[PDB]
Design a binder for this molecule. Structure first.
Ligand SMILES: Cc1cc2nc3c(=O)[nH]c(=O)nc-3n(C[C@H](O)[C@H](O)[C@H](O)COP(=O)(O)O)c2cc1C
Ligand code: SF4
Ligand code: SF4
Ligand code: SF4
Ligand code: FES
Ligand code: FES
Ligand SMILES: [K+]
Lengths: 264, 430, 214, 42, 87
């Protein structure tokens, strides 16, 4: 236990470095905390509140993506409080989410859909009318249908930190807080399809890939890119002998989680 | 003591609450401000921290957190960074005007408290984040700070005590969420008024990434009088663990809505019928009271009969003492309309950063509008209760809790009124 | 009614002539010196407020000028301007009446004040008189609740209002004078009507109640 | 020592530049500000 | 963002020719082992299966994500470049 602290996930002991978050300790144990706004290569935002978990001998659930474990914490992940918190947060997301799933590019690729089936309720009590947000025109690559946006600020954080353009942000307040650009500006830089990758909902989709196929149809062939000398690892998504899509692969020594616009 | 109330004017701290005397430097000096503050600063940070701890002053913001402990979180050696004191002069909570009154009428009290607290934690500067609508109050505060700077109380020698302190005033631009601690810190930092998560706490990473302490105007302004008159006197006022003197802002259906300075643990009936002139129509006409601003829930007349003005007493009454804003509603009040107006205020003032507050407070506003119209069924009351419980405790800051609490209080107390409205609507529409 | 998008119009294109006066540039320099070095991005709100005070409303050219002066991203400036409510992103009248309609003002009958203002100005809420003289909006709590009902016109509070009192206030503004702030019910500030229930004995002065050893 | 007259009338004759004029006036009374070592966070 | 599909080893085959049907334009194949995907709990188990079946195999080592240093307080730094300008 040299420069390490002992914590517990469901009573199972594990050594962690100081500064390790609850989510990181949980995935060290081998369980994946639900998330929408946390990305391991973006900065910590902590807004979507999907990662609320119950610590033993603690009354309030904590955000696993942001809270660092202190010492001896027993992270109850499948507890009643954690399940209730996940159900409530999923209910609040799907209250104003639009019924766009058949006409959406996130067919089987939707974190909102998958985490709904895995952690949320199976029905809704929302008897009111939903909101609608007009779409933007940020370029010929990223198609925006911003009614589907859940305001997780992943695109804003990516553009601020990795693309380094500072062009996206949240304008407004409350339920009317809109992600995008205030002016008619084109989000046209290199490394700009990675917002299509990291947007969990279908708010930011690919315009060449629009309405073409579905992820269950697409076969995944793991290949290397030749458009530059980086040699970024990619997945070619192919359906019926046709190249449909280019996605990145995780490789921490070459391209991490992203690929350029040329190869995408 | 057992019975609390009937405070003496010789014991009242805010001696010029009502604006009848001069608010300038000469008026503050005649009223007793800036007296022996050089001796206080030479006594130093540990003595002031012990004085506030033994005074037992709690946060006037509404959090209720012990001021001595909160200020003692910053009693650390410097790590190469400056340390800051920030004054929450927002005061966006409804029903509340006490911060505005003491800023515009005793601003030198606020400046002296800024100096004393900044010395208490160890600090170079106090940023006063004032509400942007309080333009006259902000200019008044700046005139007082100019008088202090010219008198040498602040700047390069803090009252001749070999201490460098600077008091700045920064104005908001109209956001109730900018009254929050971390959101106020972000607003000073120049971003939007969105609160940041804790940890890191402001005592470690705060404004500009420096250790800082955010404190209420009332807390800061009563700090130097606490230091001058001792913590024993302030602890003697009020009950155990709810000690001292509070500014109560009585508004609504009362004969004389007013801001008054009164001892803690005063009965609510005694306070209303002594200072407000009583409820319009009488105590029998009184229906409900929201006793701590809009974030605290409501209490009916039956428990209003014998309730005190403590944090602990209102928690036992299933409420809280927030900004000590006593909103009184008589029998003529549309109680569901008042609560729905409060929820509409929370919808307009939510910052929208985090999903439970954003979506749930909008949902609660829509359901409360339908409740006012009577356009729902009694199962939706339990549905709204569950929605409020999902909002409460799952949010980033306490605006979600402060918006879920009035709905909880209305459902807890005035449920037959809601059922009567729904039944009347169902009868007259079918 | 406000929309948090920008539509390119001839009155609000990024070519409307906006530039700070030299006095405003000196004030901007004072604000930047007020904030610490390396964190001049924290001066966005006072500089944007100064731009609004100079120009009336805030055009997109003013937003871009503030961004250029402070060397901060214009999208961050747009974030601040759209987040904060009292920044006027559309042109308003000379007198910007804001009627508080939160619950204690509603209890003290701010609705009658709103309806009399609507009938007097001939306009609804959120719109402007055709002579570009009065804009009338509803707002949340303005921090003066014991003086309910109350309005804010530009930077001045008008408190303890009656329909007659707000009628003479509108008449004074139309005549072009200063209606003077404060409550109109005879009380000077938040004091109780019909006498003082506290702070009647004069303050004691220096050296009163001082603990020993100080 | 009068206690029957309101004494905040100095706020009646305030223009729209009073706060910033006072800030510019107090700009000479302040300590030198700390620096982070860089011109901006970029 | 889910990682439940990266827990088990898999063995697939090299892609063969898919052509266009003259009548309907469907995808036609001449190889039977086109959709043959096998699941294994261990790399050595997959290698043993390939060796006992006599197929030539190409094995790729599992790429686990590196543990990241995540800190919410880094977003609000005094002097470092990690200070975010928005949320
Ligand atoms: C939505 C919201 C609004 C708040 N508004 C204020 C305010 O206007 N003034 C204030 O002093 N505290 C306000 N607070 C409470 C602050 O967290 C608290 O006052 C601050 O931490 C200072 O603590 P204190 O009470 O010990 O001075 C607000 C809190 C929330 C969640
Ligand atoms: S983003 Fe997901 S939940 Fe939303 S419409 Fe698309 S598939 Fe459905
Ligand atoms: S557009 Fe997508 S990535 Fe951006 S905040 Fe919305 S949901 Fe998140
Ligand atoms: S609780 Fe509401 S006001 Fe607070 S961070 Fe969340 S959205 Fe913003
Ligand atoms: S994943 Fe933690 S709040 Fe979003
Ligand atoms: S509720 Fe109207 S000023 Fe506060
Ligand atoms: K997407």
């Amino acid at each position: 236990a040299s420069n390490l602290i002992e914590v517990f996930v469901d009573g199972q002991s594990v050594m962690v470095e100081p500064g390790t978050t609850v989510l990181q300790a949980c995935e060290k144990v081998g369980m994946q905390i639900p998330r929408f706004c946390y990305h391991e290569r973006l900065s910590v935002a902590g807004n979507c509140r999907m990662c609320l978990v119950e610590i033993e001998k603690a009354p309030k659930v904590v955000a696993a993506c942001a809270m660092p474990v202190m010492k001896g914490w027993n992270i109850l992940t499948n507890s009643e409080k954690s399940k209730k918190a996940r159900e409530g947060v999923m209910e609040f997301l799907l209250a104003n989410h639009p019924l766009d799933c058949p006409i959406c590019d996130q067919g089987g690729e939707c974190d909102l859909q998958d985490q709904s089936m895995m952690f949320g309720s199976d029905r809704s009590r929302f008897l009111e009318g939903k909101r609608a947000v007009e779409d933007k025109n940020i370029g010929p690559l990223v198609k925006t249908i911003m009614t589907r946006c859940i305001q997780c600020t992943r695109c804003i954080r990516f553009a601020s930190e990795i693309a380094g353009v500072d062009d996206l942000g949240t304008t407004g307040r409350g339920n009317d807080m809109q992600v995008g650009t205030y002016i008619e500006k084109m989000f046209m830089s290199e490394l700009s399809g990675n917002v299509i990758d990291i947007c969990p909902v279908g708010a930011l989709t690919s315009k060449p890939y629009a309405f073409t196929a579905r992820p269950w149809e697409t076969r995944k062939t793991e290949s290397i890119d030749v458009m530059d000398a980086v040699g970024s690892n990619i997945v070619v998504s192919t359906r019926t002998g046709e190249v449909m899509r280019i996605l990145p692969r995780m490789h921490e020594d070459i391209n991490e989680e992203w690929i350029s616009d040329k190869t995408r | 003591k057992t019975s609390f109330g009937s405070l003496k004017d010789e014991d009242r701290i805010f001696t010029n609450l009502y604006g009848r005397h001069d608010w300038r430097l000469k008026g503050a000096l005649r009223r007793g401000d800036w007296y022996k503050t050089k001796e206080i600063l030479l006594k130093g940070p540990d003595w002031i921290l012990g004085e506030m701890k033994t005074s037992g002053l709690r946060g006037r913001g509404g959090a209720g957190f012990p001021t001595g402990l909160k200020w003692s979180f910053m009693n650390k050696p410097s790590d190469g960074r400056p340390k800051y004191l920030v004054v929450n002069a927002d005061e966006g909570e409804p029903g509340t005007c006490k911060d505005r009154e003491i800023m515009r009428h005793d601003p030198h009290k606020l400046v002296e408290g800024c100096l004393v607290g900044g010395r208490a934690m160890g600090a170079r500067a106090a940023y006063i984040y004032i509400r942007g609508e309080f333009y006259n109050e902000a200019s008044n505060l700046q005139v007082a700070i100019r008088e202090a700077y010219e008198a040498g109380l602040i700047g390069k020698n803090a009252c001749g005590s070999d201490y460098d302190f600077d008091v700045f005033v920064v104005r908001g631009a109209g956001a109730y969420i900018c009254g929050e601690e971390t959101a106020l810190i972000e607003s000073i930092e120049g971003k939007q008024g969105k609160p940041r998560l804790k940890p890191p706490f402001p005592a470690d990473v705060g404004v500009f990434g420096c250790p800082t302490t955010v404190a209420n105007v009332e807390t800061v302004a009563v700090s130097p009088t606490i230091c001058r008159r001792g913590g024993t006197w302030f602890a003697g006022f009020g009950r155990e663990r709810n000690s001292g003197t509070k500014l109560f802002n009585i508004s609504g259906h009362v004969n004389h809505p007013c801001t008054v300075e009164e001892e803690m643990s005063v009965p609510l009936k005694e306070l209303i019928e002594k200072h407000a002139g009583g409820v319009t129509g009488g105590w029998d006409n009184l229906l409900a009271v929201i006793p701590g601003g809009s974030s605290t829930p409501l209490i009916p007349k039956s428990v209003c009969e014998t309730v005190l003005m403590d944090f602990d007493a209102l928690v036992q009454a299933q409420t809280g003492l927030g900004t000590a804003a006593v909103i009184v509603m008589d029998r003529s009040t549309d109680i569901v309309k008042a609560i729905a107006r409060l929820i509409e205020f929370y919808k307009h003032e939510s910052c929208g950063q985090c999903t439970p507050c954003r979506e749930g407070v909008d949902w609660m506003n829509k359901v409360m509008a339908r409740f006012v119209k009577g356009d729902a069924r009694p199962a939706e009351i339990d549905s709204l209760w569950e929605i409020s419980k999902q909002i409460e405790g799952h949010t980033i800051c306490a605006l979600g809790d402060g918006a879920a609490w009035p709905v909880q209080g209305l459902i807890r107390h005035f449920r037959p009124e809601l059922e009567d409205r729904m039944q009347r609507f169902a009868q007259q529409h079918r | 009614g406000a929309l948090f998008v920008h539509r390119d119009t001839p009155e609000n294109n990024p070519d409307t002539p906006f530039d700070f006066t030299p006095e405003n540039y000196k004030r901007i320099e004072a604000i930047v010196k007020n904030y610490p070095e390396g964190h001049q991005a924290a001066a966005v709100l006072p500089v944007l407020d100064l731009a609004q005070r100079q120009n009336g409303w805030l055009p997109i050219s003013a937003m871009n000028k503030v961004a250029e002066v402070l060397q901060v991203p214009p999208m961050r400036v747009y974030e601040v301007a759209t987040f904060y409510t009292m920044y006027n992103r559309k042109p308003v009248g000379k007198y910007h009446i804001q009627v508080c309609t939160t619950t204690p003002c509603m209890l003290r009958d701010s609705d009658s004040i709103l309806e009399t203002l609507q009938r007097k100005l001939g306009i609804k809420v959120g719109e402007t008189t055709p002579d570009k003289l009065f804009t009338l909006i509803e707002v949340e709590c303005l921090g003066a609740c014991v003086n309910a009902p109350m309005v804010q016109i530009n930077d001045n509070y008008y408190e303890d209002l009656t329909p007659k009192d707000i009628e003479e206030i509108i008449d004074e503004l139309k005549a072009g004078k200063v209606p003077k702030p404060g409550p109109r019910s005879g009380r000077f500030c938040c004091e109780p009507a019909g006498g003082l229930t506290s702070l009647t004995e004069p303050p004691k002065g220096p050296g009163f109640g001082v603990q020993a050893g100080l | 020592t009068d206690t029957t007259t309101y004494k905040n009338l100095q706020h009646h004759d305030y223009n729209t530049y009073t706060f910033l004029d006072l800030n510019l006036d107090l700009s000479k009374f302040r300590l030198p500000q700390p620096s982070s070592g860089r011109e901006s966070p970029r | 963002s889910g990682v439940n599909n990266t827990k088990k080893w898999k063995m697939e085959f090299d892609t063969r020719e898919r052509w266009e049907n003259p009548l309907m334009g469907w995808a036609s194949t001449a190889d039977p082992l086109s959709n043959m995907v096998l699941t294994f709990s261990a790399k050595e188990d997959a290698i043993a299966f390939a060796e006992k079946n006599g197929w030539s195999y190409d094995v790729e080592e599992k790429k686990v994500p590196k543990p990241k240093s995540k800190s919410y307080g880094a977003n609000f730094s005094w002097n470092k470049r990690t200070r975010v300008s928005t949320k």
